[PDB]
Structures are given as structure tokens and as C-alpha cells.
Amino acid sequence: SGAIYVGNYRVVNRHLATHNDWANLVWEDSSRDLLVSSTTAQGCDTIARCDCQTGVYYCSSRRKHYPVSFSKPSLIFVEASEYYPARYQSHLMLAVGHSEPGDCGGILRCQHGVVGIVSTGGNGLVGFADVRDLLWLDE
Ligand SMILES: CSc1ncccc1NC(=O)N1CCC[C@H](C(N)=O)C1
Ligand SMILES: [Zn+2]
DSSP, X not given: OOOEEETTEEEEEGGGOOHHHHHTEEEEEGGGXXXXXXXXXXXXXXXXXXXXXXXXXXXXXXXXXXXXXXXXSXXXXXXXXXXXXXXXXXXXXXXXXXXXXXXTTOEEEETTEEEEEEEEEETTEEEEEEOTTOGGGGO
């Protein structure tokens, strides 16, 4: 679990969005595993606007942060799960690191701010849904 709180927006994994997220929907994209809902309170976070390919992510299954080198946002094949059929997920960045399903939502940050959230994993890999291209989150 986990979310990004920026301005009057909450960014979560689309597959973990609650009834309240869907009732306050601003934007969602199944191909990116992202959903953004509106909030009444001002958020605590800042979004990176950069091309960093190194950062640190929070791994809830280890209660620890890990440093990672990650690929540029791309279209990556993701096998079927209980939440989605087998498909290509876009804007996804992979890195070598530990993850378990419950780790989705953990934030990846660089020196400039929030880069994305944990969205996929398996066999020593971890995938992050990028949010750096969503410029409207800042306005
Ligand atoms: C951190 S998630 C993970 N980690 C390790 C093993 C397995 C997983 N799960 C995983 O990749 N899923 C399940 C949840 C929806 C994901 C998606 N974005 O399509 C795909
Ligand atoms: Zn950066």
C-alpha cells in the first residue's frame, strides 16, 4: 500500500484504489496501473521533473529503503494477475530489488522529489509506475 499526496490530489495504484478514490476520480489509466483522486486537504509531497535513473524506494515487506538504478519509462509485458489480464503496462521502469505484492504504493524518490510508485515485481526485480510526465499534478 501507499499513495502520493500532491496539492489536492492523491495518486495510488489503480488496482488498490478504494471506493472513495473512485467516487472522487480525477484520472485513471489501466495501462499504467495509476489512479488519481481529489482530496480536501493539501498534500505533503513534491513531484520530480527530471531524467534521473537512480533513486531510493521504500520496501514495506522489509521495512527498509533501498537504492536502485532503474530503466527509462517503457512498455513492458506484465503477466496476468487477479487484477489484470496479461498485457503491456506503459510508463513502467524496472530495477533490480526485492518486492512482494503488498509492496505496491511504496514511493521511489530521487534528489528532486517523487519519481513514481512500486507497481510490479518478481524474481529480484521491482517495477515503478512513473509520474514525472503528469505535469498537471503541480497545478
Ligand atoms: C510489487 S508487485 C509484485 N512483486 C513481487 C511479485 C509479484 C508482484 N505482483 C505484481 O507484479 N502484480 C500484481 C499486482 C498488479 C501488478 C500490475 N501492475 O499489473 C502486477
Ligand atoms: Zn531527479
